[PDB]
Amino acid sequence: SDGNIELTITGMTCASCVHNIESKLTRTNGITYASVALATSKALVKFDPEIIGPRDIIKIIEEIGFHASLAQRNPNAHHLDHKMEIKQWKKSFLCSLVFGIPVMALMIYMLIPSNEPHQSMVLDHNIIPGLSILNLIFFILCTFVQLLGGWYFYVQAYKSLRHRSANMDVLIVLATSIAYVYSLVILVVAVAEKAERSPVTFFDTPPMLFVFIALGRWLEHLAKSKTSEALAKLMSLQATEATVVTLGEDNLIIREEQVPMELVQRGDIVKVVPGGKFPVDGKVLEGNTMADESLITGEAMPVTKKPGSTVIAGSINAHGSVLIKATHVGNDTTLAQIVKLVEEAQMSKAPIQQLADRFSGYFVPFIIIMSTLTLVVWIVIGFIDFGVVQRYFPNPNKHISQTEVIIRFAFQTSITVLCIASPSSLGLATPTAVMVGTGVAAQNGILIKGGKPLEMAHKIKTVMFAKTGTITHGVPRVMRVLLLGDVATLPLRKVLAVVGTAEASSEHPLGVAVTKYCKEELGTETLGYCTDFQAVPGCGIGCKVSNVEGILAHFSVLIGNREWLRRNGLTISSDVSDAMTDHEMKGQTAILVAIDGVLCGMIAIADAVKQEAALAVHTLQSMGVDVVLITGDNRKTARAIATQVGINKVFAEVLPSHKVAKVQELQNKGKKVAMVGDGVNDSPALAQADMGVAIGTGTDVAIEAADVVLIRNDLLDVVASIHLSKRTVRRIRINLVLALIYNLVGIPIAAGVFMPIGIVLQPWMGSAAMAASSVSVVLSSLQLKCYKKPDLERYEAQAHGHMKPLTASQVSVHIG
Ligand SMILES: [Cu+2]
């Protein structure tokens, strides 16, 4: 509602454009947030609707020099498939190969001394003083390479220079231009003065420069294309053709028609043949079959479906033909939500990437200044203190002046210094790692969103769990119905009917179960009439009930906890106080029923704790994070469920009114708190907390309050979410370390500091060491794909030996 616009940008290649655009839009008044992702090439800027409009944003962006447009809906694979870049770089490398092989052959022919040479290396035979035939060949071929292979770099550098920015191709164009002009000048000088010896020229590096540059830029796109595998596979899974059928009266198909997805709407009925994908979500009408969503949620066992159940678009039918009633069509399909969440996850950049952008925005000028300083200091030391350099240049050759060797060495070390820096290794250190991590998470059911929770996941000290929906299954079952008052005037059928018709009014999870039990075991599907239904959450419900003879032919309602009776002026006896005590010790909550001020009896409610609840909490405790439990039920149930799980401190009797203060009090110490709720029920608590985990949410992954979503209703994915996130955060540090050692070692080696040792690099040897740098960063990120999902026997393997039992004695509770 605040003009949250997302723009797609075409032509953004380097890692400094992100910083440039971010700063340019941030410094403009009316805009406070600016995040654009290099990998997705999409921007996310929020602006005030009244001050400026999207037209101003697009004109500003096109003033910067990049084509911008509104984000599309259907087509997204061509941005991340990298096909165009791969084809272009393959063509460029193959084109440049024809001019690099002859240079390599000529260079190597000078290298090996022949045992019996035909004329003992006469390929440097002079024809006109100052110019050898080898130098003529090098000059001509390098001129052709420069006028043919450097066109793209020249164009890109010219486009970048139109603005105040400095980019990567500036380094390449500077290196090539200097290595060309210096050699051309020295050749002209030598030929003009009729020098007897042809000086050595830098006419061989650009042909060897471009081959390695193109090879590196092709291999790194090839490695990048493997980072977007998960998203591409998810996108290319939804069907397009729907077999819509028309039901006359008794599901009879009058005709068969084929309609595309963009035209089909809710309310239509579609038919699926065996081996065909489910096109749309909906409800199963008739027919029993099985379907697999291994590529949707990541499960392995093929689930069985029966009429009256739901389907997920993308799954493949196995047995027979089934007709379903379409409910979700288009962008609201679960797969579309998953795709949207994964795409938007690479938008909220962490601060570490912000520093990496600030440093990479000022890297090229730093390299240029270092190169100029190196050249100047080498000239100064040559023409001031000749002793240091002659100690390592001890051969005075009559064919070359002593100034000439100093000038050549200075220029060589000032070229290879700026031809060895790799800003790309800095730029794509974080995006590749985070995107591979998010993809491999999404392939396993975990749906981590946003880049901030990635490095936020490293520093949780305590994690918060909610009782219902997360530890327990969520489907309560009644154990037994107990009666305390009169039996004649209050028969079991009467109380069953009145409780059922009173609980039918509300939508409480236990109310549905108790109504189903009453209706089933009583034998009638009818119900009475309810009025004046008071609904106070966390306390109880009271109502007036009429028409009780419709069920008994085969009234003040007070339902709530212990304090509910006390609130309405009802006493609680000592004998009844000992009735629910035994049930609540077994983790079974109880409901008191009282009609007309009479102690009618007791109702038992039991919820089964999941088996995975034992391992996930203990693995987290072993990992080094605290855990606590919060619930709105009584004290005794919280203690009972905690022991069956292994959590010491609990927060019981929490009203659904405040429900946020416990988050604050854990954050008063300064630590970070993450709560594992269920979704729409605990939205205020999740969003306030640093990391909200919405577990057990099927086909409802469109949650804005939480930042970690789990599709499968499995508690082990909570452990796997942090486990996979830590292994992802470590890759940024490793990638950046490899992105700093390379530059801080590559400069001094190319700065000529290692002349006493005797290691000097030719400029072409400085780019072959650059192609190996960019690829090594991406291949390091691709190693995360070698991740096998752990299973139950894997987790319990390291858990053997240390399973400490705990009792209710060592179980703390809240303080007021
Ligand atoms: Cu370069």
UniProtKB/Swiss-Prot annotation:
Changing residue 784 to P: In WD; increased protein degradation; the mutant has a diffuse cytoplasmic localization pattern and is absent from TGN under conditions of low-copper levels. Changing residue 96 to R: In WD; uncertain significance. Changing residue 530 to Y: In WD; uncertain significance. Changing residue 677 to V: In WD; decreased copper transport activity; loss of ATPase activity. Changing residue 633 to V: In WD; decreased copper transport activity; loss of ATPase activity. GO terms for molecular function: ATP binding; ATP hydrolysis activity; copper ion binding; copper ion transmembrane transporter activity; P-type divalent copper transporter activity; P-type monovalent copper transporter activity. Changing residue 104 to I: In WD; uncertain significance. Changing residue 470 to A: In WD; uncertain significance. Changing residue 199 to L: In WD; decreased copper transport activity; increased ATPase activity. Keywords: ATP-binding, Copper, Copper transport, Cytoplasm, Disease variant, Endosome, Golgi apparatus, Ion transport, Magnesium, Membrane, Metal-binding, Mitochondrion, Nucleotide-binding, Phosphoprotein, Repeat, Translocase, Transmembrane, Transmembrane helix, Transport. Changing residue 431 to L: In WD; common mutation; decreased copper transport activity; no effect on ATPase activity. Changing residue 271 to R: Decreased copper transport activity; no effect on ATPase activity. Changing residue 55 to Q: In WD; uncertain significance; does not affect interaction with COMMD1. Changing residue 758 to S: In WD; uncertain significance. Mg(2+) binds at residues 678, 682. It is an enzyme of class 7 (translocase). Its main location: Golgi. It is a multi-pass membrane protein. Changing residue 541 to T: In WD; yeast complementation assays show that the variant intermediately rescue iron-uptake deficiency of yeast mutant ccc2. Changing residue 470 to S: Decreased copper transport activity with no effect on ATPase activity. Changing residue 677 to E: In WD; uncertain significance. Copper ion transmembrane transporter involved in the export of copper out of the cells. It is involved in copper homeostasis in the liver, where it ensures the efflux of copper from hepatocytes into the bile in response to copper overload. This is Copper-transporting ATPase 2. It comes from Homo sapiens. The gene is ATP7B.
